[PDB]
Every structure is written in structure tokens, then in C-alpha cells.
Design a protein around this ligand. Structure first.
Ligand SMILES: [Cu+2]
Ligand SMILES: [Cu+2]
Ligand SMILES: [Cu+2]
Ligand SMILES: [Cu+2]
Ligand SMILES: [Cu+2]
Ligand SMILES: [Cu+2]
Ligand SMILES: [Cu+2]
Ligand SMILES: [Cu+2]
Ligand SMILES: [Cu+2]
Ligand SMILES: [Cu+2]
Ligand SMILES: [Cu+2]
Lengths: 467, 467, 467, 467
């Protein structure tokens, strides 16, 4: 006569979901096999005065129920003012903290702020190296990305990016092309530390929102240096090692970096109608430039399929499509060539935008998100990654954010975030016939989620290769 | 082929669950028919620098999905340092805020802080008047309870309680008995406002924890005047009207108040072995005293059955039982007499402690919480409220708190809260055969939860008659 | 045959004197033309539990006998314990109230508490803007000063000041210099309100007394953060408009602010032997710093001459003198240069200290107080403000406080306040030949007094330009 | 060139004025030879929660500049709610404190509360015994007067008065006559202490205002037992010793008491048209009664000329006159007979009410106050005390209260108190030709004032023989 919710969880397996809460100021881990929150942490408990808990990634652990470690960052300043919430803290904390957190089988333990350890605070995507010996963070207000060592929380290398527009007018500054500089960033404080915590470094006062390339062009984003902005988003990793790729929203390119030798090696060009690559020019041992004649479209999501054979960059807003490179030559990224573009009427108009993806373990399908401003239903589109075509899309609810997948490939687990003020949930869809199985309560504004990986191999379809 | 969680929710009915999050700093409403969080609010977004979101109660709304209004209060000061969270907050806010919040069918809207409007801040239980025309709040650091007008947030009446121990030292102050003073508290500021916001009026520096009667006796609770403490917990309402009952943890009594005439009328004596009532003595128009020759045990939970015929007070710690009075004579509480005592061989230890209850609509069963300190499993006991016997005890997990019931009587919904740092969940139990149907994630440390009532009759089994 | 006291008052003209009473808890307006107190008000009647009525200023009124409005603030907490009075209050109010009071021709009426309207409570000097459209208040326990809107009692701008001493030992924290931060202070609560009423924000538990910079160095002033104190005193106005100046006692500087654009523009260096100015450094749009290599002396009284040509700051205790800048360039305070120091062989001891002044309407003379601890007679010094020389000193009695002048320039009216427990009076001195005409009874501990101005020109020699 | 106010003071002589401040909460002593306030005290500094400083009297001292002691009492409860002031303290302290204060030549020292010592709290007139070995206080809410020992502050004797109306109806309770009881009051606590502090014993909730005999008749005075009220006012002393006289406002009588034998001896009948005396009946050793056929008018002011030859009682409201008895027979007050009535065509209305008086040292003249509700000017009448006629009436200003005289008989010094919310001052009048010399500021609501006596003979025209 009665339904037990346990039957629903029994089918999911012994997987641990973890998600930060953005405006909620919290991070939580959930047992998908029982429905319990295993543990949660509220950053205000630690004196954090603007705990916008933003992106995160978890290191593999052979048994997450015993222990696991993750990294979660924060945003601050005027990022507090860009949602519908009529917040009242007019001068909030500067955020850009990089927290190290460990779950010990019972509770979450805040271990330290790595931005205080290294001196470098970064506020957008967090990713784990495929060796699980470190992590990377990017930031689109300072335009810096860095890989950090896991043991020491010290920077291994950090790169700063700068835009020199052909036309020094905000409306034309990207559309009419410009030169992007890539500059090795060196510490200036004793013990090899950076002087770049909080707001130090910020070119603009908040991270650009969806369709923010328009806001910046119209002079609606305050800051010292918006003409010089490229809006770095992420540093993602080739799961075969060696390469890391930094994605630049505004000039619509990704930069391939040699992790070991600490040099850029290639610049991939995002928009449909451009060549596979632009020309990287060395200026000196610390400085490279790339000329971009015009920016046909901004881009956002960047990442690798889990065999590392395909590299993807999503064009957004001006174009909406998935640009796909053959990246099978692991020895030379300057040979990576455009091999497909995924297009669909599903990419209706300016919206939806696709900012998140996850692959199946065998690389044959991709789940990608479809985001719209309130009130249009947001949801998930399924991509056949062999023919590079959209299979299907499903409507879910408001404000779709990140996707993770269970490591046996059976269930995609996503978050919907209420634009920080309305309905929010965890969503579960089964990959066998791509049907939504339903929603679980989630009183948080997640801009990220992961399933804690068990092995290095698990990282290939976790927060390492994609965002 | 797969199980859809939507079948679980389909059986529950169109009920909205609301709960604050204690250390999470948040409050959230969830749609039990779909599993979505409907909306959540983080008080740090509104300049709250100690947002320990504490107790709450919801006003009836003819359609909660369209809108509903609720009340939620906060604790602050040293309440921050008494859980297993290693807090590093320098100057915590003082709490005792009394927020008015409105869900408008999309989001929660902070309306105002009634502690600022009225001047009176209180940080323990919140209850709705059975007329839905106001609310009451109690506090066990200041020992004050008051009923507030719903429309103006001004106080209707407030009462201050004070202990005068027979023996002047903490170990014996309650054991060897004393006299409690009941004092009409009137305002002192322009506009008829109190001067009692934040920590003003505190006798002790945190609310007593479970078994905290022993901590205070042993000189382990700091504050200005712990010898004067009575630890008021709540002001609960007779569903038939007229009467309100203030519970006093330390001297193990409840005081019955006439609401419209604004006078105390009876003192109910908690512990097994004491008479039905103690002698209330009028000292003047604003002051009453009651002599308590010895305090056999402290008490906590207090409430009426939904038809007003029974009144309950839980003895806790030194005795663990449910004391029951016949309150069927609505016209005169000085006639209310003890009629039954629920006891169990399981409750001889210090724990479990039973601090929360909910009746079924027909009043024949009560569900009560069984709390233990870590690591003993916490649960729910089912009480036969016709024969006053325990039917059944179910184990669930750590740190059990409040219970609500859907208004057709079919499902109990509870919260488990991880002691603010471990596993946390919403539990659902069906009342036909008293079986646990499972758990939903809830990354919050709730010490309260309600189902939003639609009618005044629904309040009889919500946060009005019991806590 | 008999002397009529009316013949004495006939000569003073139709001027209204207003003074708060400090420990008396009262404030009073006196008619200098008849000897009557026109009206008085006792703040304990309005539920004030620490009514230390502190500083005040009065808005101009076309006819003060018909009506006038004024602002008066309060101090609390341990300010109650630092005078000679053996107070026995156990739970004193926190003070920092900012009362708006209106005399209506018959009585005083308490309009409201601006600290409750704005959320910002401040307990030291109160000043009227030169346009009479607002008022300012400083505070040296919180180190915050602010200009408020007269119609709404909301803050126009507020500045917080913090000391970062070179040496982290109280004895040398100021002598060995440090860096002061000047931070824009923004609200945190709904309605644009601050959360800084009462003791919220205090770095130290009472305002430093005369020479109390030795006590703080000596570890004798309790508080959460005495190493960060600068003891802000006042915010005084350029009678020509545009600029406001904040005095800081401990590091011996004044900061010039642009009121319109809301930025600091200059730092004036107090001690003889320092440059005219120290270098103001902008850190971001809300934050400036200034490096002070050493603090040679603390300073106190600060004010402009009524034509705005001269700015003055008194060095107190370690040097006793009047530092004078040329402020004739209204367009650029960074050009203001020291042009004179008033010294006297009589001022080479630790005392007298000169904490108050008033100019004649033509700016040619100043009357300045000479304060000493008991038992040395306190008095008034007359300063030649063209040659910058002491003209005359006259002894009066104990504990000299403020000086006001009748707006025709003819009579200086001051207050002596018995150290809150001995002799107190109003003194009347004629300015033609600078003789004391006598004393009038005043049972009050006034630390302030004003003559109600009639015009905006009158404010140039009232509580607007000097304290 | 200028008039010095010092010439005004030089003519008054070396006299010390002292006055309490009623709503100001303060008391203050003023040097009439210099214009300085010598010292003031604020009762709120000592924790007094309703410092309505009411009546006072000073002991003689050989040199008041070097030191003097005085007694000053307070009122509490609903006496706070009876003036213009919109007070906000809804539940004030109960008052009825009797403070001992010493001026030590520098400051006021609060020595103790005699009401705590003795356990008897009384709130109306305070007088000094003519031997200066004690003082007396009366109270018109409890209807008790007592003489206290100066060294111990213990009661020598206390008397309770009770009214038993011929008709139990408030309107006719006095008019239609009744029996007053005079009852010896004995201590009821260990150590010879009373249990009558604060509001203990009150029959009505405030002291009757001028004409308040109409308010109590009309049911407008709240309290336990207004039908039992006599409104006792004062206990004044025959300057020849032996006799004390207790005045009763509502029944229009004075009771003469033998101080040494502690027994009433006579009842003087106030109203014009009644015999000299009514018949005192002994009931037992502790109890006497007197039948009052009907009460034609209420009375108030009562006192002796400084030689003890005349005793006066003022009828007020229903008749306004001065009733005079020949009290030359020091050995037997049952022989004292009416000898004159001072009447005026100007006293036909309900007002003015003549509540206070002082004689010149040779007993030839009397200065009596003429009080009216706002807005009629209040003033002073001069009485020829040889022919029992009015010599002169002068108008002064609002709210005239008490009069004292310099002991050389040259200057009458009085207080006006602005109904606690408007204009207040000290007035000085020369007695040779009865001219007002003018006003000094006094930001106080004085209902009493004295000049400190130097000898036992000075007391005869101080707050000992009259009020
Ligand atoms: Cu991104
Ligand atoms: Cu985000
Ligand atoms: Cu409780
Ligand atoms: Cu709690
Ligand atoms: Cu609970
Ligand atoms: Cu000052
Ligand atoms: Cu002063
Ligand atoms: Cu002061
Ligand atoms: Cu009287
Ligand atoms: Cu009087
Ligand atoms: Cu009086």
C-alpha cells in the first residue's frame, strides 16, 4: 500500500554526491544509497563574511564513506549583487578563498585556505589534475589560472591573460578583434607567495553572468580595466596527462599549456567559421601573444572526452553549438584540428546556453545543460558523441547548473538552483533510455556538483576533464 | 525497468514542509508532492552576523503554493560555541532576532525583524496563536515569554520569570526548592517598545542543552545570574482558546495564563510524585509567586492534544516520562488534574530524552522523539493516547528533533540534524502501520519543522498546541 | 537701593543658551535675556538607562523663542565608571544614542533616536553642516564619524578609521608610528541601516579622558582592540562648504574629506616639527591609507576660523600648542600649509590642555579653554588670531569645558562642570576688554553648550566649524 | 562699562540654597554669594529607577560652605504619569526612598536610604525637628507620618491615619463627614524595622494634585482604598518643642501630637464656619478617633510662626483662606483657639491655591505662594501677620512652589518649576519693600527649596515649622 523511497536509492549504488550552495553559504555531501546528507559545513561558522561557495572538485578516494578530500572556492564583492536577492550587505567580504576540506567519515573539517597559503585567490572553476596530485583554479575577474600542488597548496605555475582590443570602445572591443597576451605570473612575497588574495588583481567587479559579454560591451560592468578583460573561466586537463587547457570566454579561444615545461603551445579558435587554431607568438621567456582578427562569438564550456581523443568548446549566445577538435595526437597540440560541430534547432535563439557537460565512461554519449533566464524550462540535452548529433532534450525546471555521472555510467545527477531565490533540486536521469527518474530536495544554489571518484580513472568523467 | 522517486512523493499529498537550519544559517520550504525545494533564504544575505536559525511556526494559508507567511527566530552570542563545530568567529552577533518571512509563490521575502519593531528579542520556541492572529516566543536565557500581534508585531503581553532558591548555591538551587516569581513585563521606550533586543536581559550565556540542568548546577554555564534561572522554553496554546501555557525547564512546572485577561491562573507540577498543581499566590496586580518545596526533576516538552482534553508535560533527565492532566474543564485550569503518566523500562537512564511531539488529528496516537547524545541511535516512539502506553519505538539515526504530521493524519515528517556536524535528513513515517518509508536529503541542522497549515483546525496539530 | 539681576541680563541680548548635562542626565535651554530656564528634559523619563548627555549642536532658527531643533548624543557602558562619582548602577545602558529634540516655544519634545533610524550610534562630538541640512557625529571608541541627513536622520556617508602600529606593544604603538586606514563604511541591514547601535563596534570600553593616551599606552584602558584605536573625536566643517575634517587624537592628524564626492583628500600632520601634511595613498575606491613615521604628540581640538582662511589643530600633553594651517585655497586642501604655531612658556607642563575654542565673528580673536585635573584652577585663554600669540589668560574655577559666543561677538558664554561632582556654573565674559562678568548657576556636568544660531552665518562661530 | 552679575550676588550675603528637581532626578546646592552651583547629585547614578526627587530639609551647620547634611525623599509608581511629560517607563520604581546626603565642602555624598534602615518609606514633606536631632516625613498615599532619629535613621514614633466615610460613595465620602482613626504604628520585623518600603501601604496610586480632592471623589484616582484616604501631607514642629502637627488634606484637619509621650492631644478644625477644634476620643492605648460631621473644605499648608504664638492652616479649593489659631499656650494645645482668617476678594475662584509659606524672622510678615494650573501667572502674596491681611501680590511665571528666606530676613528665595516641562527658575525678592529682584536659571522641577540654616533659631523660619 505504501512506497518506500529506499527503493529509489537502492538502484543508484554506493555513490556520494557533493555540492556547494552559492548564496546559501554551505557545502554538503549526500549519500545516494540512503537519502541522508552525510555532512554539511557552513562557512560563516569560520568567520567567512561573504561565503558565496562557488566551484568545487573532489580527489578520488577508494571509499568516500570513510574519508575524502575536496577543494571549494568562494566569490565576494559585487558578485553578491547580481541575483534577484535583495541582499543588504553593501560592502561584503572580497571572497576568492580556496578552501581545502576533508570529510573524515563523520564530519567535514575545514583544513585551510589555500589562497592564504599560496597568496593567490581565484574565484571560478576548480578542477583536479588527472594524477590527483593537485588542482587548478581559474578566475574571470583577474584573468589568472594556476595549478596548485595538493600537498603544499603552493602554486606550481600561474598564467595571467590580457586583452588589447583593436578598437578601444567597449561595444567593439571584442567583436573587432584584438591581441591577447599570455604572461607567466611570478610570486612577489617571501617564501614564493603571491600578493593576489581577495580583490587584488580584479579587472571587473563581478564574474560575467550568462550573456555578460553584452553587459560588458554596453558599459554595464564596473571595474578598473574592463577593456583588458578576457574572462578566463577554467583550466581543464587532458586526461592523458601533460596538457592543461585554459578557456577564455570573451575572445572565444582556449590556450593549450604544457604543464611540465610551463609554456603555452597552442591556441584553439572557438567560433564556427574560424580556422582550427590561431597563431601563438613567443615574445620572451615569460610572454606570448595571439592575434584574433575578430571575435564572432564568445565561448564558455571546454573539456575533453575521457579517452582524450576529442576536445570540445561550446560557443554561446552569438553562436550556440559545440565545436569539436580531433585531439588524438597527444604529442603535439598544434596539430589538433576541427573535426565536427554539433548544431541543433534546440539551440533556439540567444538562449539556451550550454555551460556544463559530462560524458559516459565509454565516451559515446554526452549530457550537456540547457540554461535560460527565468521563466523558460531549463534542462538537459543528450549528444551522440560518435555521430556528433543531438539525440534528445528534456525539460526540468528553473536554473540548470552542473552535471555529474555515477562511475558505472548508469545515472546522471544534476543540480537546479532557483537563480538563488526560487526552486532548487538535485535531478536524477538514467542513461540507458535517457529518462528523468525525479528530483530530490536541495536547499542550496549550487553552481557545481560532483560524485566523489573512487580511482584516477573515475576522474576522466569528473571535475578534471570538463566543467 | 527503473524506479521513479515521483511515485514516492505522489502518495504524500500536496503538503509544504518548512524547516530552519540552525548552524547552516538557512531556512527552506520543500514541496512534498514533487521533491523540489520551493525556495530557501540565507540570513547572512541580510546582514545577520550570527544566523543560528532556530525555531519556527507557519500561519495557515488557504493555498501554501501560492503564498504563506511564517515566523523564525535566531540565537547568537555563546550559543555559537557549544556544538562540535570548531567555530572561529571573533565577535558573533547576539541573535534573538524574530524574522517575519513571506513565501510569495516563487521566493521567500524577508518582511522585517519583529524584535526590532517590538523591542523584545527571544530565541527559543515560536508558536502560532490558535486564532492565527499572532504568535508567541519563549526564551530560556532571559526567562521571558510573550504573545505578539500578527499585523503590528507589537507585544500583546509578556511575562518575566525569576527563581529564588532555598539554598544559595548552584548544586542545590533547584533540588532543595525555591520560589518562582511571575512578573508582568511592560515596555520602557517611546512607542511602547521594549529595550530587550539581542543579549539584553540574559541571565546565562547560552540556552541549556539536553541534560543542561546538571551543567548549570555544576557551575559550568556562565552568565550574570544563573541562580535566578528557570529556563522558560515555550508558550503553547489551548486549541479551544483562552489559555496559554509557559513551560519552565529548571523548576519542572508549567504556568497556565489567561490570554485575554492577562493573568496567570494555575501552576502545573511536572514530576511524578508531586500533586497536580502548586499554589499560585497573587502578590499584586503585576506579580505572582509560587513556592516549590523541592524540584524532583527538570521538564521540557509541553502541549495539548488537538481537542484540548489532555495536557502533557515531559519530565526529562532525572525522570524520563510523560506527565498527563485532564484539561477537559476548559472553564477553569485550577481544576486540571493528573490522569496518566507514560513510562517505559527503556527510559530509566539519563536518556533518551523526549522533547518533541505531534498528535494525530483524532488525538488517539502521539509520535514523540527519543534523543540521545552521539553515538546512540535516536528515534521516534509511538504513544497510544487513549490507554497512555508506548506502542512502539523505531531507531533512525543521529540527533532527532521535531515532528510534524500531514493534516489528513497519514504521514509523520521529522528532522534529524547531525548535532550540527554529521548526518542530517528528513524522515517520513506512515501512521496506518507506523513504518518508516525512508529519508530525504536535508543539509541543515534543523531544530524545528512544520507542515504549512491550510485552516485554523490544521493548527491543532502544528506548531501552536505543542513543540 | 537694590541691584536687579535683570540689569545684568539686559545687556546680553536675546540669546538662547542650550547645554547637556553629562552625568545629570538632563539637557536645558536658558534665556540669557531674563534668567529663566525655558525648558529642560531628563532622559531617564524616556527609558534611557545610561543618560550621559554628551555633545550637542543646534540648527539655526529665525526665532529660537518660538522654536528650535537640536541634536544631543549619549555615552554609556564603562564611561559611567571613570569619573569621581561612586556610581552603583550594575547593568548600565550602552549609550551612543543620537537624540533629535525640538523646543516648540513651551517645552522640549523628544522627536526620535537617529541611532535607531540610521542604525549607527556614536557618542562624541556633534556638529551642524554649514548649510543646516544635516549634522555629523564622531566617536573615539568605535573610530567612526558620519554626516547625517537632517530630514531623514539617515547617513549620507560614514568613515571608519583603524590603526596598524609598527610596534605591537601598547606602550610604543603610537610613538613608533604606524599606518592609518580610512575605510568607507557602508550599511548591512534592510532599509540601508547600519548594525552599530550601542557598544557595537567599540575597540575600547570608554572615551579616552584628557591625557588618556598615556593610560591606553599603559594597558590601563580595557577593550577588544586598543592597538587599532585612533580615537576619532569630531568631524568639523569648512564654513565655505565642500570640506569636512575628521580629527584623530592618538596619531595626531586630521583628515580632510570631500563631502560631495565622499573621498578623503589630505592628511594634516599635527605636531610641531612634522611636515604640513602626510601622504594620502589610495588603495581602492573605498580604502585609503597614510603612513605616520612616528607620533610626536597626540592632538585634540580642530576647527576653522569663521572665514575659512585658517584651520587649527591643538597638540595636547606631549606638546601643548595650537598648530595653524593656511586653508585659504578652498579649491585644493592638499596645498594647505602650516603658517603659525601658538606657543606659551606657560604651556610647557603636561597641562593645561586646550580642548575647546570659539572665534569672534571677524576672526581676529579666539577664546580657548585651559583644562587641568583637580585642584588647579581652569580658565580661558585669549588668542590673537592675526599675530598668533596668547593675549591673556584668566582663571575661573574647576573643570572648564566648552565656549560659545553671542552672535554679535560681545559675550563669550562657557561652562564649568565640577568633574561631575563639585562646583559647576555658566561663565559670562565680555569680549571688549576680556573680563569675566560673573557666573550663573548650572547644576549640570556639561561637556558642550551652544547659543541657538539664527542664520547660516551665525553657524560659522557655533558648533559647526569648531568644537 | 558692563554690569557684573557679581554685584547682584554681593548683596544677598553668604547663603546656600538647596533644591531637589522632581522629574530632573537631581538635587543641587547653589552659593547665592557667587552664582556657582556648589555641587549636584543625580540619583540615577546610584541605581535609582524612578528618581522623582521630592521634598527635602537641611540640618543647621555652623558653616554650610564647609559642610552640611540634608534629607531628600522620592516618589515612584504612577506619580510618574501625572505631569505633561509623555514618559515611556510604564512600570517605574516604587520610590518612597528617604535619602541622607552630606555636602562635604566639595561634593554631595549619598550616605544611605533611611527607608531601608528603618523599613518605613514615605514620599511627601520632609521637616527637621527644632532640636536638629531628627527629621520627619509624611505621606499622603499611605497616610503615615513619622519622626526619625538623625543618628540612627530609626523611627521614634509613626502614626497611621484612616478615614471611615459616613457614606461609602466617593462623591460624598468627605462632604458628608466621617470618622478619622489615628493609629500608633509599631514595627513588625526583627530589629525594630517596619515592612513599609516602596508602595507597601499605599491606599491610592499617586499623591493628590492641587484640587485632586475633586479627582478622588469622581473615581479618577486608582488604588486599593481611596474611600479610606485622608491624604496626610506633612508633620511640622512647634519651634518651642514638645508638639508636632500632622496636616490631613481631605478631611480638613490637623492633629497635634505630643512628641515625648507619643500621643495625639488635639484636632484643629480647618474650614471657616467650624469650631476651633473637633473632639479627640481615646479608644485604647494605640488608637484614637475624631468625628467630623461634614467636610466643608480640604486644607493643605500648615505651620507655626517662628515664635510659636500662631498656627496656620490653609483651606484650599472649596474655600481659599488662611485659618489662624492662637497657640500661645505652649502647655495645652486643646486650648488653642481660632483668632483670625486671612481672606481676599481675589481668592473666590477655585484657584489660587496657597500651598507654601515662609515668615520673616520677627514674625511680622509672611510670604505665601499663589499657585494656578497653566496658563495663569503664579506668584507670591505678602501677608501682614500682625493684622492678618494681604499687603501685596506679585505675579512671576508658571508653577510656583516653595519659598525660603535668608536668615537675616532680607531676601525671599523661591522656585518655579514649569509643571515639569516648561520654564523654571529661582526668584529673589527683597523684603524691605517687597520688590522682585529677578530670576536665576534652574533647570529643575523643584517642589522644595531651603537656605541652609546655621543655628537652631534659623530653623524656626526654615523647613521645620512650615512647608
Ligand atoms: Cu564555467
Ligand atoms: Cu557560479
Ligand atoms: Cu524545547
Ligand atoms: Cu535549538
Ligand atoms: Cu529540537
Ligand atoms: Cu573633543
Ligand atoms: Cu569639554
Ligand atoms: Cu566630553
Ligand atoms: Cu504640601
Ligand atoms: Cu510645592
Ligand atoms: Cu511635589
Amino acid at each position: 500500500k505504501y512506497v518506500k523511497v529506499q527503493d529509489f536509492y537502492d538502484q543508484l549504488g554506493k555513490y556520494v554526491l557533493v555540492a556547494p550552495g552559492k548564496f546559501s553559504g554551505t557545502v554538503a555531501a549526500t549519500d545516494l544509497s540512503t537519502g541522508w546528507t552525510m555532512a554539511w559545513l557552513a562557512a560563516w561558522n569560520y568567520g567567512d563574511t561573504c561565503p558565496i561557495m562557488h566551484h568545487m572538485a573532489a580527489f578520488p578516494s577508494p571509499d568516500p564513506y570513510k574519508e575524502f578530500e575536496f577543494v571549494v572556492n568562494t566569490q565576494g564583492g559585487k558578485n553578491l549583487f547580481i541575483y534577484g536577492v535583495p541582499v543588504t550587505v553593501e560592502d561584503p567580504g572580497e571572497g576568492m578563498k580556496i578552501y581545502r576540506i576533508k570529510y573524515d567519515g563523520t564530519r567535514m573539517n575545514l583544513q585551510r585556505d589555500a589562497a592564504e597559503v599560496s597568496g593567490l585567490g581565484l574565484g571560478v572553476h576548480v578542477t583536479i589534475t588527472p594524477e590527483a596530485d593537485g588542482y587548478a583554479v581559474g578566475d574571470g575577474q583577474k584573468d589568472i589560472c594556476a595549478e596548485f600542488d595538493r600537498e603544499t597548496d603552493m602554486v606550481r605555475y600561474a598564467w595571467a591573460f590580457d586583452w588589447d582590443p583593436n578598437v578601444k570602445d567597449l561595444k567593439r572591443a571584442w567583436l573587432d578583434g584584438g591581441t591577447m597576451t599570455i604572461k607567466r605570473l611570478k610570486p612577489t612575497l617571501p617564501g614564493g607567495r603571491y600578493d593576489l588574495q581577495g580583490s587584488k588583481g580584479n579587472k571587473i567587479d563581478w564574474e560575467l553572468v550568462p550573456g555578460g559579454e553584452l553587459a560588458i560591451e554596453d558599459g554595464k560592468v564596473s571595474g578598473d580595466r574592463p577593456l583588458h578583460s578576457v574572462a578566463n573561466d577554467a583550466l581543464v586537463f587532458d586526461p592523458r596527462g601533460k596538457w592543461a587547457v585554459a578557456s577564455m570566454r570573451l575572445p572565444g579561444v582556449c590556450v593549450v599549456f604544457d604543464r611540465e615545461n610551463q609554456v603555452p603551445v597552442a591556441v584553439l579558435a572557438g567560433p564556427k567559421g574560424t580556422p582550427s587554431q590561431f597563431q601563438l607568438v613567443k615574445v620572451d621567456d615569460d610572454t606570448w601573444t595571439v592575434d584574433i582578427p575578430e571575435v564572432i562569438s564568445a565561448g564558455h564550456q571546454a573539456g575533453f572526452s575521457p579517452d582524450g581523443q576529442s576536445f570540445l568548446f561550446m560557443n554561446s549566445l552569438r553562436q550556440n553549438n559545440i565545436m569539436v577538435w580531433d585531439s588524438s595526437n597527444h604529442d603535439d597540440p598544434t596539430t589538433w584540428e576541427k573535426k565536427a560541430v554539433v548544431e541543433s534547432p534546440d539551440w533556439r535563439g540567444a538562449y539556451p546556453n550550454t555551460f556544463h557537460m559530462v560524458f559516459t565512461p565509454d565516451a559515446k554519449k554526452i549530457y550537456v545543460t540547457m540554461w535560460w533566464p527565468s521563466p523558460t524550462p531549463n534542462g538537459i540535452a543528450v549528444i551522440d558523441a560518435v555521430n556528433w548529433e543531438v539525440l534528445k532534450e528534456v525539460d526540468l525546471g528553473p536554473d540548470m547548473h552542473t552535471l555529474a555521472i555515477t562511475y558505472d555510467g548508469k545515472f546522471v545527477v544534476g543540480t537546479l538552483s532557483g537563480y538563488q531565490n526560487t526552486a532548487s533540486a538535485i535531478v536524477v536521469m538514467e542513461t540507458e533510455t535517457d529518462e528523468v527518474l525525479g528530483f530530490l530536495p536541495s536547499p542550496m544554489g549550487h553552481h557545481d556538483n560532483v560524485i566523489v571518484p573512487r580511482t584516477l580513472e573515475d576522474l576522466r568523467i569528473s571535475r578534471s576533464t570538463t566543467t
